[PDB]
Symmetry: C2
Subunit: 409 residues, 2 copies
């Protein structure tokens, strides 16, 4: 059951990520696409790709028989679901398993037992999780790695407290401001919870930290979270490669929780307008200019001339920025967002520029005020909404200036 | 006396690197550009830009008069020289100091004392450097020093640059692999002792040959923050150009001691040269340029789509930097990145890199590898097939002459 050819059934940036991971593993990367995505970067990047009919996710990507028939015609050995449509579906996982493809992910039994929140409540209880008995709670997340043998590591704790509509938008690692006692509790509790569940693979435990630092267990995601990069860049673990090992069932070579070497931020570059209440704004990508440079990583499902219809989730790309300290990572994030430009779409880039500037998010350096309601409730939203010249370059005494004047003088 | 505004006195990727370092530090950046570079990324990316009006390095960036004049006209408090041009010109360094601008680099006396091979040959003996009294198949291994004006010295890391042409680094990696810890310890302590006896401050690289059967010899210190620095900067986790800003400020070293390197990194220089033609350079249009992206991959490009390359300047267009938890992983990830990276319209060494990261001599057996400073030109099986106006209008304003170079036709 040693992975060889992987059908990555997901669209977008996570498809690109798993294709790249498979290449790094030397595995053969197969992809699949909906009618709108027939030219998307993941489709062109894969070693081969297969077409599926229809336009909605329900036609294109959710149909078990489609994805399994594509794996059959590919002769794919493995399936990977990404972080999207299939990934939480235990019934699909079962169907893949009994089709006999190596399912890169947790047992359907585990996905069910952790999804059934009554059952998951009893799991947490048996695990002796810090269950709840909050105001302005904070969101913190143990990235658990667990093997089929029951070795468990906490690769690092993220913070994901910048949310609107319970969607994350900005994510942080290691979790900025926790007492050592809190971090120890979080780690050990996570290990206990996933062992009590017998979970294996990559995963995440979402915890919610109240004001004054009470911890409530929230949930286990049972999937690779979109948030994965900030714990990759802070720990050094290649989580998807580890996930391939675990699917192989090789022991976890990581014996102990890696000390995080620095600080990292992630920004979800969604196609929605903070001035328009973060409503999607589907349309053309007239230009796309990633901020490739020092301390910056980019992941994207979108490229120059891409067309972004409404059929799928709005998140185009993830910008990941890393430094030796939170201060330095902030400065680098400011520069990276200042240089990153996207044209023709409304994007959350102005909001990210704002919040990375906002004192409320900078904080005192000993504590900060961001809470999961903050973007909804207390951020002074001043991002004004979204939507020829002739441009000439004039040198005045040798000083370079750009001038834009009416295209009709 | 602190830095506040920096003239980034160079062309290309190092210009962009130091502009970005400035943007991070919150320092205003003034670029200068020769006429060929009027649309380069650095000129469109800096906060301010001044034309030098020269066609060639001899006509332009090397002219002290012009670049000091630009410094005046922009009011830069400080000047940062890139990894070429005047960066090791002590007379220029002196001129900048006499201008009173913060020269972001070593003292002119140090640049002299270590540029003169005789003086350096005295200095290294007085430092008691490890020395061999020539080698057949030497490796090139170099220690990145950091030093403040106070005398704290840190070895940021040891870097292997043995994939060289006779005169040109092509692929670089850190930490220097396949060394005994005894050898490292010796190259670390020797790099400090040389740096302290030089009285050096700023960023610097100390270069050694490591021979077959492990004989170590010092070669030279290059008193510049070398083009190969990013691999060290990410493996050590030190923003070396920032630290260079700090030391130009004269702060004590923040880093108190040599950090333990974490993982492994490679840096591939995308020279605009035909490996299949004998590494001959050529001019031409970069008609397309799509960088690799995603995990463990970084690109520092001085060149952009629709950029055109004239032969009067450094053939180095961009450099690709790839990092991993271990050398094997980093090699794998580089074999991906060099495959994803595509450029078209210009001869580039990308195929040679793609080959060498696939060639066993550089992959090594696990504790040794066969690459040596001659190996590329002497033993690599070269598989690769060859690739195939301004209207300067004078205005008088209250009697001040003011040339305005407009775009010509309009």
């Amino acid at each position: 059951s040693k992975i060889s050819k992987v059908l990555v059934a997901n669209r977008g940036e996570i498809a690109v990520r798993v294709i790249r991971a498979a290449k790094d593993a030397g595995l053969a990367s197969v992809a699949v696409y909906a009618e709108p995505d027939a030219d998307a970067p993941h489709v062109r990047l894969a070693d081969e790709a297969f077409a599926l009919g229809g336009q909605t996710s329900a036609e294109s990507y959710l149909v078990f028989e489609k994805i399994l028939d594509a794996a059959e015609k590919s002769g794919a050995n493995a399936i990977h679901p990404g972080y999207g449509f299939l990934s939480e579906n235990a019934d699909f996982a079962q169907a893949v398993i009994d089709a006999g493809l190596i399912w890169i992910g947790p047992s359907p039994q585990s996905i069910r037992d952790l999804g059934d929140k009554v059952t998951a409540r009893h799991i947490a209880a048996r695990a002796k999780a810090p269950l709840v008995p909050l105001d302005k709670p904070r969101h913190v997340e143990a990235q658990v790695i667990a093997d089929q043998h029951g070795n468990v590591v906490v690769a690092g704790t993220r913070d994901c407290s910048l949310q609107r509509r319970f969607q994350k938008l900005v994510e942080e690692a290691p979790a900025p401001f926790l007492t050592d006692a809190q971090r120890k509790e979080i780690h050990e509790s996570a290990k206990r919870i996933c062992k009590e569940a017998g979970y294996y693979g990559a995963g995440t435990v979402e915890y919610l930290v109240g004001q004054d630092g009470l911890i409530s267990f929230l949930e286990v995601n049972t999937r690779l979270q979109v948030e994965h990069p900030v714990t990759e860049e802070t720990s050094g673990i290649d989580l998807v490669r580890q996930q391939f090992k675990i699917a192989n069932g090789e022991p976890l070579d990581i014996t102990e929780d890696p000390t995080p070497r620095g600080h990292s931020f992630e920004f979800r570059i969604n196609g929605e307008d903070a001035g328009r209440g973060f409503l999607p704004a589907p349309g053309p990508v007239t230009k796309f200019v990633a901020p490739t440079g020092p301390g910056v990583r980019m992941d994207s499902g979108v490229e120059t001339g891409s067309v972004i219809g409404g059929q799928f989730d709005s998140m185009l790309a993830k910008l990941i920025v890393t430094g030796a300290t939170r201060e330095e990572a902030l400065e680098r994030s400011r520069r990276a967002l200042a240089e990153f430009t996207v044209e023709g779409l409304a994007t959350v880039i102005p909001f990210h520029r704002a919040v990375v500037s906002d004192p409320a998010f900078i904080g005192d350096g000993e504590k900060f005020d961001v809470h999961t309601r903050w973007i909804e409730t207390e951020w002074n939203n001043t991002v004004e909404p979204f939507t020829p010249r002739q441009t000439v370059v004039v040198e005045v005494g040798g000083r370079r200036l750009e001038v834009s004047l009416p295209g009709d003088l």
